[PDB]
Amino acid sequence: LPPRPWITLKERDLPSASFTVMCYNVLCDKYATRQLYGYCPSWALNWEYRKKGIMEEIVNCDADIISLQEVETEQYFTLFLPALKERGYDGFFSPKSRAKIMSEQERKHVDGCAIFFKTEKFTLVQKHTVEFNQVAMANSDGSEAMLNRVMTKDNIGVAVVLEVHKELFKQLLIVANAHMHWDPEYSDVKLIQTMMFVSEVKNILEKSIPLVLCADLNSLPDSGVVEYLSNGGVADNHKDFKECLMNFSCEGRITHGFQLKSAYENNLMPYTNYTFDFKGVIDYIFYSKTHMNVEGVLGPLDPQWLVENNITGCPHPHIPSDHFSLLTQLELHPP
Ligand SMILES: [Mg+2]
Ligand SMILES: [Mg+2]
């Protein structure tokens, strides 16, 4: 397995701070099944085996900020957090489904989103969880769709407000990490969840701070979701929607005041989720282009190596998740 190649996009340095951000969906044990991944042997799907490769990936990236999806509750506390503490990180985790009723056993296996940060470079000011179902319910204002299709979806985002230490260049940063509904037939939900996350992050912001937004969006670069984040808004009749929408605007258009750019824009990875049936870019690191520049990204796994090894889908004995990690070095300028 060849280490991945760094792509430099722009030279360093005005006074500014450099830091690296990882976004990685680890694939939780619950969903790593032979039914879903019938091309990967059971011994390679097993969590006792896969968690080694996942921890290795995270260790090797050595990001200053790490955003994980599909972190299983009990794994956050017994694996991800203890091991990352030993590397000088602190973390914040929130599971999905906290209001759902379930056994103690089941509660351990519910997954959610985690943000880790290097304590030498960052101090946590606030931490928040955004429950999309609750925000949908609270803003359904007589839309049956909001209620039937959006509210019934249990997805979450987490966000942390960090103080960036001066001796890297009082100075704040917000990192947000979310994981949107999966279903291809639910582009409206994916888009609404993204709009709710962003408007909810904006509320966090008052109480302006640059944003790093990591997510598994389950959405391709040509979607309403990506157009919305990238262009600072969308048409309220976008085809992905198939009145209450203005609740998330902040006239025909839903608007946000972040000015975001994808770290990997213009096709720097040909895919981010890699399976037999589906290969595409659905994971993203977005940043406030006002405050920050991209210096570089970790480029794709050498594609020749995958053809050499006849690897048509992940995970695989040597690739422990069906998603590839995203790793970016960003340059922040204070105001
Ligand atoms: Mg998944
Ligand atoms: Mg996914």
Curated annotation (Swiss-Prot):
Outcome when changing residue 278 to A: Loss of deadenylase activity
Location in the cell: Cytoplasm; Nucleus
Could you state one GO biological process linked to this protein? regulatory ncRNA-mediated gene silencing
From the UniProt entry, list the residue stretches annotated as the region Nuclease domain.
1-335
The protein's annotated catalytic reaction(s) are:
Exonucleolytic cleavage of poly(A) to 5'-AMP
User: Which amino acids does the record list as binding Mg(2+) 2?
Assistant: 216
Q: How is its activity regulated?
A: Inhibited by free AMP, and with lesser efficiency also by CMP, GMP, UMP, ATP and neomycin.
The UniProt annotation places Mg(2+) 1 binding at 70
Which cofactor does the UniProt annotation name? Mg(2+)
Note how many cofactor molecules are bound and how. Answer: Binds 2 magnesium ions, but the ions interact each with only 1 or 2 residues.
**Where do the annotations place substrate binding?**
70, 106, 179, 184, 218, 273, 278
Q: What is this protein called?
A: CCR4-NOT transcription complex subunit 6-like
What organism does the UniProt record list as the source? Homo sapiens
Instruction: Please state the gene responsible for encoding this protein.
Output: CNOT6L
